[PDB]
PDB file of C-alpha atoms and ligand atoms in Angstrom:
ATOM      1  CA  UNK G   1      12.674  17.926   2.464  1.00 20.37           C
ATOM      2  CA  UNK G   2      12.331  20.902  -0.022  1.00 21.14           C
ATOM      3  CA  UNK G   3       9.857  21.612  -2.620  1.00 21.97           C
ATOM      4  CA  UNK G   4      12.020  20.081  -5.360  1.00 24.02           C
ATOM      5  CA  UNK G   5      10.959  16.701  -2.899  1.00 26.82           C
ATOM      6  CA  UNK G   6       7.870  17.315  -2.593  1.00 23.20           C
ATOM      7  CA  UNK G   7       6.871  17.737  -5.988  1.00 23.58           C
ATOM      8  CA  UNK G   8       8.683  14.969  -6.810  1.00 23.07           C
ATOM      9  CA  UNK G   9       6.570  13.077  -5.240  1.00 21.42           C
ATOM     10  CA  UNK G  10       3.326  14.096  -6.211  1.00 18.94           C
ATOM     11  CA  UNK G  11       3.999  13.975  -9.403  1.00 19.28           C
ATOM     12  CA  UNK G  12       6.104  11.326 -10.189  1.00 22.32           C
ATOM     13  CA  UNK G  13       8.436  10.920 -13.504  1.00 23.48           C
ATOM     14  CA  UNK G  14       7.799   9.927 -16.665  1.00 21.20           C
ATOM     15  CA  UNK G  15      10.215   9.944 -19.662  1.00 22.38           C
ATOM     16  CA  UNK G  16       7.656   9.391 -22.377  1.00 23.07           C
ATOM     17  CA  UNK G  17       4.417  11.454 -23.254  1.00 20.11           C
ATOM     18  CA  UNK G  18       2.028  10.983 -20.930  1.00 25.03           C
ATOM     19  CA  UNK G  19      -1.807  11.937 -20.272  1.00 22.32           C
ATOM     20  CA  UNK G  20      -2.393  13.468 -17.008  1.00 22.92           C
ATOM     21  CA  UNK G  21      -5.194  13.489 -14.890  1.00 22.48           C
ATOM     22  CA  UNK G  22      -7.349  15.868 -16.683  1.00 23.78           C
ATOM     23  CA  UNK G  23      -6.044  14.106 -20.053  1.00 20.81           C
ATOM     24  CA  UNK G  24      -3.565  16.503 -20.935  1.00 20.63           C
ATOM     25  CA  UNK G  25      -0.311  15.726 -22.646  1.00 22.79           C
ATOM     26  CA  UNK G  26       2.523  15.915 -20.206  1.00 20.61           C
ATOM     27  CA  UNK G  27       5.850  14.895 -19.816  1.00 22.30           C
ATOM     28  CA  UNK G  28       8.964  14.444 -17.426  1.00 22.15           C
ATOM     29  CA  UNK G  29       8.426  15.704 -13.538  1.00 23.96           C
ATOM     30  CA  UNK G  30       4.247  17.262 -13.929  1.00 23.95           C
ATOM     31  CA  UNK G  31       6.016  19.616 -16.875  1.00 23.98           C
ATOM     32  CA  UNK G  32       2.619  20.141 -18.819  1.00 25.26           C
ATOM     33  CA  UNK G  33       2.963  20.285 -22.896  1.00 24.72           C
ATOM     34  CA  UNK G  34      -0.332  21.173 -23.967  1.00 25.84           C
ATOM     35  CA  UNK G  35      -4.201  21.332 -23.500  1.00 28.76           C
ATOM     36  CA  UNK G  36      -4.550  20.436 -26.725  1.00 28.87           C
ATOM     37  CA  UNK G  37      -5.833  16.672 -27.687  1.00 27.89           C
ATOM     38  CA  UNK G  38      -3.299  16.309 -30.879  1.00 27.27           C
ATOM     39  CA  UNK G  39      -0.306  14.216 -30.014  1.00 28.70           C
ATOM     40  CA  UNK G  40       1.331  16.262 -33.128  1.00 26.30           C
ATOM     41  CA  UNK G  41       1.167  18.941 -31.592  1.00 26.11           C
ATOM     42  CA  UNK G  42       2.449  17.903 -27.950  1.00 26.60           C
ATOM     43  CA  UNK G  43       5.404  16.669 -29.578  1.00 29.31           C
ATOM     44  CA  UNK G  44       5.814  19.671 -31.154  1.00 27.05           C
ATOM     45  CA  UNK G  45       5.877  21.496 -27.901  1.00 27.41           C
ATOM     46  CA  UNK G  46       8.127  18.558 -26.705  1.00 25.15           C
ATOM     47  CA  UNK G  47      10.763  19.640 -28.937  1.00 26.60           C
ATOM     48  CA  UNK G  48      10.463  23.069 -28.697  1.00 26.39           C
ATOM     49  CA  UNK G  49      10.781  22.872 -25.067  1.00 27.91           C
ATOM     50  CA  UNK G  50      13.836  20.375 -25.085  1.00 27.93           C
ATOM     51  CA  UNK G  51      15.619  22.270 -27.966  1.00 29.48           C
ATOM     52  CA  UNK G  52      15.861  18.647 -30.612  1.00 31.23           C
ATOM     53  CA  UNK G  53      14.103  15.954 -32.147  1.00 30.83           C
ATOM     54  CA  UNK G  54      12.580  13.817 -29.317  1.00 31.97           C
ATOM     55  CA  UNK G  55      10.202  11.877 -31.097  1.00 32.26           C
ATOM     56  CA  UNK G  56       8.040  11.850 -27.546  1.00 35.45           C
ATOM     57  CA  UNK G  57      11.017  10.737 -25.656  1.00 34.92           C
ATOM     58  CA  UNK G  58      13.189  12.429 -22.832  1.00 36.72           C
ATOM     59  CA  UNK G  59      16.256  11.938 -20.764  1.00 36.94           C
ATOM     60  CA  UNK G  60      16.054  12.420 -16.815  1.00 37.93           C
ATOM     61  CA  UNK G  61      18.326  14.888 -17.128  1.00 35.58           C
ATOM     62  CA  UNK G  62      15.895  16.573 -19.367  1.00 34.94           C
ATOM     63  CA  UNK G  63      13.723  16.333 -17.518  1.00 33.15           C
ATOM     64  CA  UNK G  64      15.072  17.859 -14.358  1.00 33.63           C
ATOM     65  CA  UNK G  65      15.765  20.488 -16.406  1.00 34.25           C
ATOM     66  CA  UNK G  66      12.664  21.471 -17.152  1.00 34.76           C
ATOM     67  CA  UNK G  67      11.910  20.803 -13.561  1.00 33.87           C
ATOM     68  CA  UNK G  68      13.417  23.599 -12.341  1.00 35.76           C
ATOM     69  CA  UNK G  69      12.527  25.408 -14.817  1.00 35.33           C
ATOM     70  CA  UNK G  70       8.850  25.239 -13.845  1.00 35.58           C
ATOM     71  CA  UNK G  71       9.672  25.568 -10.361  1.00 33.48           C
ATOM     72  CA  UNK G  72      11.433  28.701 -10.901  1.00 34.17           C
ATOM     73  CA  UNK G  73       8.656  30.400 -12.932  1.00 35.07           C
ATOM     74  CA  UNK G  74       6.336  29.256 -10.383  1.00 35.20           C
ATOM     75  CA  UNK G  75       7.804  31.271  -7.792  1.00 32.19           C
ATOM     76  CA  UNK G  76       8.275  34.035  -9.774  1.00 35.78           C
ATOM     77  CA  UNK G  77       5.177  33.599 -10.700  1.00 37.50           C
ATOM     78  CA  UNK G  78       3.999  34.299  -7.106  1.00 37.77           C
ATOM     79  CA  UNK G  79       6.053  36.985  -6.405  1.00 34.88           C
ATOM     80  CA  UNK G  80       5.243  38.416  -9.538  1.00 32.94           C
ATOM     81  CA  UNK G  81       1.134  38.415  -8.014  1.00 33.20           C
ATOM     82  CA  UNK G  82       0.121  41.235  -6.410  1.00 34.03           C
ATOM     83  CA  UNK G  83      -2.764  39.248  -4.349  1.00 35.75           C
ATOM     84  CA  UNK G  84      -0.436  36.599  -3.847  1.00 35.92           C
ATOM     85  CA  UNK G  85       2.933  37.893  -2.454  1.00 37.22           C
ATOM     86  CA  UNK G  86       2.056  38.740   0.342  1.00 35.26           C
ATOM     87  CA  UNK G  87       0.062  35.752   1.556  1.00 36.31           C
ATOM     88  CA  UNK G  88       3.287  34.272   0.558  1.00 36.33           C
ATOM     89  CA  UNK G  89       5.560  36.652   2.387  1.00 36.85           C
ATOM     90  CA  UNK G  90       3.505  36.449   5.140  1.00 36.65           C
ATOM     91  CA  UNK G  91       4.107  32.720   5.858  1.00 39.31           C
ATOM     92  CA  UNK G  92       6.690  30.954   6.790  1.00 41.78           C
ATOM     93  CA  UNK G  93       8.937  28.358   4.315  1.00 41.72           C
ATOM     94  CA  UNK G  94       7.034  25.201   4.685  1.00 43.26           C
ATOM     95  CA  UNK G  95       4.003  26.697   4.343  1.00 41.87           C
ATOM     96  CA  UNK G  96       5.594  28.528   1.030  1.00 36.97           C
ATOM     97  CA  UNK G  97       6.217  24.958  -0.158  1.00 33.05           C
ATOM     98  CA  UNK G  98       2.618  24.008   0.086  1.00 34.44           C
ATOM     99  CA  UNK G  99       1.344  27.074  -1.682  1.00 34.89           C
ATOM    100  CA  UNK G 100       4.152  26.605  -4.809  1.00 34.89           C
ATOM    101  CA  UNK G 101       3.055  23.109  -4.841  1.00 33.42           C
ATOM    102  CA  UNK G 102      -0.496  24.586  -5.395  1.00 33.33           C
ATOM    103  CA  UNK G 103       0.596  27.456  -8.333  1.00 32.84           C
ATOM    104  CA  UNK G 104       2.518  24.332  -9.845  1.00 35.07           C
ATOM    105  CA  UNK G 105      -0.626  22.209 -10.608  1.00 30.46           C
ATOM    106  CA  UNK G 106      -3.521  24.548 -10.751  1.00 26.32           C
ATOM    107  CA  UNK G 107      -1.520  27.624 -12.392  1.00 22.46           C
ATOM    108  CA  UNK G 108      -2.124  30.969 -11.011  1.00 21.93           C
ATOM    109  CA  UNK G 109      -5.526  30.765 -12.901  1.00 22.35           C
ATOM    110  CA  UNK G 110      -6.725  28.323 -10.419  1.00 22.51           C
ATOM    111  CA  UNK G 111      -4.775  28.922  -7.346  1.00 21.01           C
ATOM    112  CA  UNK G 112      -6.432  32.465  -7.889  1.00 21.11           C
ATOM    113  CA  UNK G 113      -9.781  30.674  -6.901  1.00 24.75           C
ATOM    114  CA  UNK G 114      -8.575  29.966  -3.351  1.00 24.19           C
ATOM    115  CA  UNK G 115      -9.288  34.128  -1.885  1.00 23.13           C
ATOM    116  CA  UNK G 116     -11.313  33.244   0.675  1.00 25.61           C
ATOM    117  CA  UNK G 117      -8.911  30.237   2.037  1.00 24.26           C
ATOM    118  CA  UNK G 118      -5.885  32.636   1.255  1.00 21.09           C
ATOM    119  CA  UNK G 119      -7.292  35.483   3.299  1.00 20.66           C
ATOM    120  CA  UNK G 120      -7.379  32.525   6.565  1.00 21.05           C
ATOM    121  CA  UNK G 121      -3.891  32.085   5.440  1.00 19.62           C
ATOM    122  CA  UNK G 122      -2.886  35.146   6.168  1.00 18.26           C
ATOM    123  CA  UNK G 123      -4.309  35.582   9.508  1.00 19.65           C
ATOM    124  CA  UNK G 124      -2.626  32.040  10.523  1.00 18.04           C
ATOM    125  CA  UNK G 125      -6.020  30.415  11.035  1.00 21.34           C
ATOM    126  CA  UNK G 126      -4.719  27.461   9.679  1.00 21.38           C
ATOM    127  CA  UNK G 127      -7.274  24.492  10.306  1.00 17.38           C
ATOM    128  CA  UNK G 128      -9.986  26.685   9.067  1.00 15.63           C
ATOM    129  CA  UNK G 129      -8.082  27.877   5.759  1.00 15.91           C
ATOM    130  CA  UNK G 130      -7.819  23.502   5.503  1.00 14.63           C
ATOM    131  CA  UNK G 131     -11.210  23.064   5.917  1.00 14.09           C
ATOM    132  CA  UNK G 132     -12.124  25.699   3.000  1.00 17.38           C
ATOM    133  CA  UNK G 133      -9.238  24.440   0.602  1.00 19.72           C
ATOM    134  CA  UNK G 134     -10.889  21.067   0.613  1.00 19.48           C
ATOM    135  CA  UNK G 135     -14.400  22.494  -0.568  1.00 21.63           C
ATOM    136  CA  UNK G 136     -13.227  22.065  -3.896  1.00 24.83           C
ATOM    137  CA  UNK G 137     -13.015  20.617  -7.016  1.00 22.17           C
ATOM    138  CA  UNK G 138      -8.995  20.451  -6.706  1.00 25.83           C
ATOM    139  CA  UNK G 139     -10.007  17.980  -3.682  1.00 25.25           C
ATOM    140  CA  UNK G 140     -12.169  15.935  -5.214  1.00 23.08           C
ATOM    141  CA  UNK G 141     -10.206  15.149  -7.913  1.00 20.93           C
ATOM    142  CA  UNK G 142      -6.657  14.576  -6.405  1.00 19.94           C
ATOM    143  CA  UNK G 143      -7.820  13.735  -3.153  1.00 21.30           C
ATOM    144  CA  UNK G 144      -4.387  12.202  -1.902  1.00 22.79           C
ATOM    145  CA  UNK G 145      -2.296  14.785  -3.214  1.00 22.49           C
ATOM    146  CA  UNK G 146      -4.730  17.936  -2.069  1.00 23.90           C
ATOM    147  CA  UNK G 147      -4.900  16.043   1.293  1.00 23.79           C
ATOM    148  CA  UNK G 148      -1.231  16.100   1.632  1.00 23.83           C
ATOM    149  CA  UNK G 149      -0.905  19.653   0.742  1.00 26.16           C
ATOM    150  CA  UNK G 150      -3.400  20.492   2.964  1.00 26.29           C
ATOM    151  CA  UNK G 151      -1.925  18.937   5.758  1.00 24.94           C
ATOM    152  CA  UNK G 152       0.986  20.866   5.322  1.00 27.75           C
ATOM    153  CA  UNK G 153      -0.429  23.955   5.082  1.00 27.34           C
ATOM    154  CA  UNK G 154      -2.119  23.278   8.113  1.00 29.25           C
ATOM    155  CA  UNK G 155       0.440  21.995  10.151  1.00 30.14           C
ATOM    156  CA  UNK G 156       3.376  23.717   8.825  1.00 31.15           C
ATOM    157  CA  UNK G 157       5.637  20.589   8.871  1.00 33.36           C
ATOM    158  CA  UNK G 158       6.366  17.679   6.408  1.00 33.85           C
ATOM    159  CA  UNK G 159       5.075  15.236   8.097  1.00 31.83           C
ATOM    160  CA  UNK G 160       2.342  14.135   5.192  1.00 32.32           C
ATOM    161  CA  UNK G 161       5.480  13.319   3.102  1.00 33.06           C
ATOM    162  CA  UNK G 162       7.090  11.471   5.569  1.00 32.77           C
TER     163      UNK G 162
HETATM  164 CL1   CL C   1       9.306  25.083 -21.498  1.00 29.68          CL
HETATM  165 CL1   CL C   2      -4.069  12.437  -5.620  1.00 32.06          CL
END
């Protein structure tokens, strides 16, 4: 198990347009196209993303493409966060994995939210940084997924996935 895994599971794959939870348009592996409610301009954003005329319509190839794309930049996007790096660096790499598949979802806009849990995090007190992350709206609206996440942050092993 990796994070390319475990993302793959939580967020499934879908070759055609698709509203997520929230009702945005999305596509492929969780790879968000816009906030906006025009289809137009989704699959506008489609193509621009994908480089050709998709008419709302991948390949899984495509898709895994812009997979690790978004995995990439999420990591980067952590490193690249001077509050979070070194909550990251501090942990070890299944515990990483949980707090990627956080900044993957939420963005760094609403991972950002999570101070008070990420200061626990950092001084390894792991089942209270749990109980805090689930005071949230992130857990009451994906209450499977946040458990899982949570659970893996806690424990520092995979087995939520298994
Ligand atoms: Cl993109
Ligand atoms: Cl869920």
């Amino acid at each position: 198990m990796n994070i390319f895994e475990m993302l793959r599971i939580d967020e499934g794959l879908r070759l055609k347009i698709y509203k997520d939870t929230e009702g945005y348009y999305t596509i492929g592996i969780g790879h968000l196209l816009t906030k906006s409610p025009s289809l137009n301009a989704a699959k506008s954003e489609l193509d621009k993303a994908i480089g050709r005329n998709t008419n709302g319509v991948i390949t899984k190839d495509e898709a895994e493409k812009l997979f690790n794309q978004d995995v990439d930049a999420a990591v980067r996007g952590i490193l690249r966060n001077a509050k979070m790096k070194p909550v990251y660096d501090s942990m070890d790499a299944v515990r990483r994995a949980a707090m990627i598949n956080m900044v993957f979802q939420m963005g760094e806009t609403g991972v950002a939210g999570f101070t008070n849990s990420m200061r626990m995090m950092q001084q390894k007190r792991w089942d209270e940084a749990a109980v805090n992350m689930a005071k949230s709206r992130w857990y009451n609206q994906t209450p499977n997924r946040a458990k899982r996440v949570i659970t893996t942050m806690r424990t520092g092993t995979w087995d939520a996935y298994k």
